[PDB]
Design an enzyme around this catalytic site. Structure first.
Site, mmCIF file in Angstrom:
data_model
loop_
_atom_site.group_PDB
_atom_site.id
_atom_site.type_symbol
_atom_site.label_atom_id
_atom_site.label_comp_id
_atom_site.label_asym_id
_atom_site.label_seq_id
_atom_site.Cartn_x
_atom_site.Cartn_y
_atom_site.Cartn_z
ATOM 1 N N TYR A 288 0.824 -1.205 0.000
ATOM 2 C CA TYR A 288 0.000 0.000 0.000
ATOM 3 C C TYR A 288 0.860 1.257 0.000
ATOM 4 O O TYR A 288 1.686 1.436 0.893
ATOM 5 C CB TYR A 288 -0.877 0.115 1.231
ATOM 6 C CG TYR A 288 -1.840 -1.015 1.536
ATOM 7 C CD1 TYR A 288 -1.390 -2.298 1.846
ATOM 8 C CD2 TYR A 288 -3.215 -0.775 1.554
ATOM 9 C CE1 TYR A 288 -2.288 -3.314 2.173
ATOM 10 C CE2 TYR A 288 -4.121 -1.786 1.878
ATOM 11 C CZ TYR A 288 -3.647 -3.050 2.189
ATOM 12 O OH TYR A 288 -4.531 -4.047 2.527
ATOM 13 N N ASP A 290 -0.152 4.338 0.604
ATOM 14 C CA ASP A 290 -1.302 5.106 1.070
ATOM 15 C C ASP A 290 -1.328 6.549 0.589
ATOM 16 O O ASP A 290 -2.367 7.052 0.164
ATOM 17 C CB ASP A 290 -1.372 5.050 2.597
ATOM 18 C CG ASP A 290 -1.344 3.620 3.126
ATOM 19 O OD1 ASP A 290 -0.265 2.987 3.087
ATOM 20 O OD2 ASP A 290 -2.397 3.124 3.565
ATOM 21 N N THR A 291 -0.186 7.215 0.649
ATOM 22 C CA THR A 291 -0.121 8.590 0.196
ATOM 23 C C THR A 291 -0.122 8.659 -1.337
ATOM 24 O O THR A 291 -0.993 9.299 -1.934
ATOM 25 C CB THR A 291 1.145 9.278 0.740
ATOM 26 O OG1 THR A 291 1.132 9.232 2.175
ATOM 27 C CG2 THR A 291 1.213 10.731 0.272
ATOM 28 N N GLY A 297 -5.144 12.097 2.356
ATOM 29 C CA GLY A 297 -5.958 13.245 2.704
ATOM 30 C C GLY A 297 -7.408 13.050 2.306
ATOM 31 O O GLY A 297 -8.326 13.538 2.972
ATOM 32 N N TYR A 374 -7.029 -0.345 7.955
ATOM 33 C CA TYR A 374 -6.212 0.454 8.864
ATOM 34 C C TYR A 374 -6.586 1.919 8.992
ATOM 35 O O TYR A 374 -7.189 2.510 8.096
ATOM 36 C CB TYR A 374 -4.737 0.368 8.474
ATOM 37 C CG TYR A 374 -4.028 -0.875 8.964
ATOM 38 C CD1 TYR A 374 -4.161 -1.299 10.285
ATOM 39 C CD2 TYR A 374 -3.161 -1.580 8.131
ATOM 40 C CE1 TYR A 374 -3.440 -2.389 10.770
ATOM 41 C CE2 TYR A 374 -2.436 -2.674 8.605
ATOM 42 C CZ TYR A 374 -2.579 -3.068 9.927
ATOM 43 O OH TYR A 374 -1.850 -4.126 10.415
ATOM 44 N N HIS A 425 5.081 -0.582 8.128
ATOM 45 C CA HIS A 425 4.450 0.690 7.989
ATOM 46 C C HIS A 425 5.549 1.698 7.852
ATOM 47 O O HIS A 425 6.132 2.159 8.825
ATOM 48 C CB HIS A 425 3.641 0.971 9.257
ATOM 49 C CG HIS A 425 2.443 0.060 9.302
ATOM 50 N ND1 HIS A 425 1.312 0.279 8.585
ATOM 51 C CD2 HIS A 425 2.268 -1.103 10.059
ATOM 52 C CE1 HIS A 425 0.479 -0.731 8.904
ATOM 53 N NE2 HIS A 425 1.024 -1.572 9.784
HETATM 54 CO CO LIG Z 1 0.634 -3.217 11.190
#
Ligand SMILES: [Co+2]
Ligand SMILES: [Co+2]
Lengths: 620, 620
Positions: A288, A290-291, A297, A374, A425
């Site tokens: 992932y 994510d950003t 955002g 998450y 992460h």
């Molecule tokens: Co974790």
């Protein structure tokens, strides 16, 4: 007024209108990304021309475009067609995620796979995840999403407790085609539920927790002007927000005497990657960004007073664009407040008979986002003594899988038959430094042990050394906790009263960086994550450590390519990129919902001031 | 009734009477240490016999004694004559520190040194420090203290701003004679003052800080019974206090449903060492063993409500003995309170439509002590999720010297001509483990990277490995931040529902350990500080990592000696000794008084519970 003000709903609608007028936003077009451009270096135009950058997706398959427009002049400054198969696909659209489960529900291969498992398709949820770049030739030039299945027994059931292992499907969200349905074998679906709100599992709720009242009778000590300009205990800064990066801090400065001294021009989490370490074909592709791929955002939560943010809270409600260019407000997406922070300084002196105690405080700016299972909290802290700190908070429900009979070296067991793949992460903080101005340099500081001998007869001596990073090629550094390694950003042209360059010291948590094999797809796509610190020469187009288009994009852009230019960074406008993260082996304690785990970094003044800057703090 | 109750003023008075009546407390005798003995292993001994351990010093030079007395029966259990030249000197008496400045004031050598520097002897304060090292033969088993001079211009002046470098004296506190006065040369005494309460230095005090009111309308959530027994959110423990170790936690346990499960039998900072890395002969011997030589509990501060401890605070006022056996109460020497600790768990689930958020809390037990120029805060934290954490807070005024013309590699400049010798603050936490009972073992856990290839074709896999420490000879471990090394204390005889040995994971901050050369005196006397983690078999007489009589001992005592027994620690009653500390290169920001710096460690449950133990926490 302020050229650092948040984007307004009006500006977004204006961008939409300008694009529509230019013939760039017809019904087949979608806004995959929209953000305001920061002002360029040096006062160019007499006044500030508000500009926005947009990534326009085409649902028909035509090439997408990157467009920059001036909302002030109502014009398209530039518009370039993007060759996605080369430079990368645009960020995933929230509407494309729902396409996956829908399509799969009508696919015979998918249905046969579920039937073989005696699962009712109507109860099978599909988590649509980024595809990344691997060995699937057909995916060349295709906008793909890979779906993993989870069973949801009823409307309020947590499907994460019921993963359907051995099954994964690839989907072309544009042509609406199921390219592949991979079934490596039927795995029992974990049966226990993970409903953390079910009294059956929570048992009677505790009644022993007495209330803690935190209030500020006279209001907060910080002021907010221009909508997002903050001033608190000598600190000055602007709180920005970007749909991709989330909360971004601008012009961080500290009032020292009759002058506002800059420290950091722009601070943000420019990227965050979550790589999974399970070699199973079902998830070995799972990473992932994510950003970069999802845009954190975009999913910022609306924070509830009393639950998410406690005390006297001041909220900001940033506006982002929806897929059609309409402005959308994220109500109370940003929390701001100050909090007591224990003892700041204290000393009881025998000789003078004076006892002295002063308390510390920190300004908090945060937001929380949710990426599927998450939830991540992003917190920036400003302390009275001049220290700046960032902390990421990871919580939510761990991604699950089946737990194999013979055990596993890459998955932990949470419940009978329920597994939790190992993963990380990892965040990247982009720090556009401005220590007393833009003429900065970075020195790597290591503790230095000395050998017993002449000049050190008792063998008690120890020192330290600082190495100036002068070129980008020499600015890719690794952590070294054993030698107490830190990095100092200083200004060689600005000295304190002791004739020493003023500076700030970056303290890292020294956690493991990307664990993947250096030859893996992920090591290349997340190259920044393989090193703790990078220093580049400031450049307008070098925004993310992974480049502008992360989705389905190979290596080739980002930090590694920036660094190659090998520019001078010794007393120049520079940017520090710090990699820091968590390495997770899920414990049973993390199920059914995991407690917050944290990671971050901080920068403390290092000869920046002429003496402690908190001698003026009252006793109260 | 509790065998772990705090010592009363009466018990100390009783010990005084018992000793006096036994003829062990003559005019020349002094109590260098007095503490209650912990119960021995074996609850079978019904009705605990309250026993006290006492170190009796003789200001006449006569051999000191170690006496154990039963306050229950009013008798002397045993009294052994101490051979200090062999087992080390007793802790320094507060009255002895005083004799140093008084003696020097009449010594011609000292007066001549001061005269040459034009310093009025009545204005020269002398910091009495322990021998620091072991070497000088002439110090024939003599009880010595070293003195460093500081000028105090007026009663309320901070002498630390005016160190008198190039001068040091050694004094025999028992024979009351100055054995040596070393003057290596005149150094200007730093002129600037460091009075942090003087308006000329603080400038106008800030008026921008609004009040933060923290209250509990219904009182605290924890209960205190038996004077020192605490119960809070499933936690149960006894807060003890020792004049040497300070706050000590006993029987830390967690209520898991019907049973009260033990985790740690006894937790304390067993030792604290502050080694200086300045090779100058004036300070190269400087090393404070705050716990062993000075007794940190003895100088605990009375904590002011609203300054040191904010909110709804419950105090404990421990009693200690003075040099004559008289009880002395330390009013409000121990603070206890609970505090909000942000978000505990949070998840907004799309599929179920359920948004869940829970707040975290921590129980705080702390005290603050003052050692000359420095002030240290010791904090223990208990979290809702079962995590235990310790944090040391270092503040006060940095130890100073002159800043050499031409610079220095072991001293930093704080102000014109004012230097701050590099040094460390290293603590040793003694954790008498009891994970679900005394049958425990320790495993070192390292992250394990994997190479791309068969079984890991995509090169994304990573694992972890655990190694049981079976013998003390192999239980001296080093940190390894790079491989995310941690240590797990488990009970091989108690398993969770997944048939896995229950355990707790120790997370270290991975800070640098003792930097001094391996052949130095300090490396020998403080060998514990050279390694991050030690594991020993429990033994009633193995209390401190440096032994019972640290002062002026040759070295090797403590951990190195205990470990030498090479006992079995694989599933036995064991003790974990964790070394952690701060390495300091004083900044200008640390002058005239330094902001708190912190270091610590924490232990998180690792398969101790069957699932998250905070699912029963209410939303409020
Ligand atoms: Co974790
Ligand atoms: Co220090």
């Amino acid at each position: 007024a302020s050229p650092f003000r948040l984007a307004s709903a009006g500006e977004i609608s204006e961008v939409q209108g300008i694009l529509r007028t230019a013939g760039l936003l017809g019904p087949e077009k979608r806004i995959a990304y929209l953000g305001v451009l920061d002002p360029a270096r040096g006062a160019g135009s007499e006044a500030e021309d508000r500009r926005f950058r947009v990534f326009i997706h085409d649902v028909s398959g035509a090439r997408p475009q990157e467009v920059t427009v001036s909302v002030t002049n109502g014009t398209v400054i530039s518009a370039v067609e993007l060759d996605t198969a080369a430079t990368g696909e645009l960020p995933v659209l929230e509407e494309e995620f729902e396409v996956v489960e829908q399509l799969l529900a009508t696919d015979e291969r998918w249905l046969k796979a579920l039937a073989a498992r005696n699962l009712d398709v109507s109860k099978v949820r599909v988590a649509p995840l980024s595809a990344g770049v691997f060995e699937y030739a057909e995916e060349r030039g295709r906008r793909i999403l890979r779906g993993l299945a989870f069973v949801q027994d009823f409307p309020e059931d947590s499907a994460w407790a019921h993963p359907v292992d051995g099954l994964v499907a690839y989907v072309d969200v544009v042509s609406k085609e199921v390219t592949r349905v991979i079934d490596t074998g039927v795995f029992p679906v974990p049966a226990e539920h993970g409903n953390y709100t079910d009294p059956e599992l929570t048992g009677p709720l505790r009644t022993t927790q007495k209330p803690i009242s935190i209030t500020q009778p006279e209001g907060p000590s910080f002021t907010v002007t221009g909508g997002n300009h903050i001033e608190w205990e000598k600190w000055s800064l602007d709180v920005g927000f970007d749909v991709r990066e989330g909360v971004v801090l601008h012009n961080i400065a500290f009032r020292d005497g009759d002058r506002l001294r800059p420290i950091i021009n722009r601070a943000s989490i420019a990227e965050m990657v979550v790589p999974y370490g399970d070699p199973s074909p079902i998830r070995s592709w799972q990473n992932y960004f994510d950003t970069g791929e999802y845009l954190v955002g975009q999913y910022a939560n609306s924070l509830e007073l009393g639950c998410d943010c406690l005390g006297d809270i001041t909220y900001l409600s940033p506006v982002i664009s929806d897929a059609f260019g309409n402005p959308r407000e994220i109500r109370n997406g940003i929390c701001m407040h100050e909090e007591d922070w224990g003892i700041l300084a204290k000393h009881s002196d025998l000789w003078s008979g004076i006892n002295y105690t002063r308390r510390n405080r920190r300004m908090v700016i945060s937001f929380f986002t949710t990426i599927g299972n998450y939830d991540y909290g992003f917190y920036w802290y400003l302390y009275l003594d001049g220290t700046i700190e960032f902390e990421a908070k990871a919580t939510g429900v761990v991604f699950t899988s089946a737990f194999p009979e013979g055990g596993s070296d890459n998955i932990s067991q949470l419940a009978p038959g329920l597994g939790a793949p190992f993963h990380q992460h990892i965040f990247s903080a982009r720090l556009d430094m401005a220590i007393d101005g833009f003429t900065n340099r970075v020195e790597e500081e290591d503790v230095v042990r000395q050998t017993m001998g002449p000049g050190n007869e008792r063998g008690n001596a120890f020192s330290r050394k600082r190495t100036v990073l002068t070129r980008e090629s020499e600015a890719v550094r690794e952590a070294d906790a054993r030698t107490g390694r830190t990095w100092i950003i200083s200004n060689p042209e600005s000295k304190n009263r002791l004739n020493e360059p003023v500076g700030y010291k970056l303290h890292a948590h020294n956690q493991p960086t990307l664990l993947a094999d250096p030859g893996s797809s992920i090591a290349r796509r997340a190259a920044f994550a393989t090193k703790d610190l990078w220093v580049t020469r400031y450049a307008d187009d070098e925004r993310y450590p992974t480049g502008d288009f992360v989705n389905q994009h190979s290596g080739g852009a980002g930090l590694p390519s920036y660094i190659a230019q090998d520019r001078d960074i010794d007393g120049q406008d520079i940017v520090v990129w710090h990699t820091f993260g968590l390495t997770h082996f899920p414990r049973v304690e993390d199920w059914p919902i995991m407690p917050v785990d944290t990671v971050g970094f901080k920068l403390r003044p290092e000869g920046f001031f002429d003496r402690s800057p908190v001698l003026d703090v009252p006793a109260n």
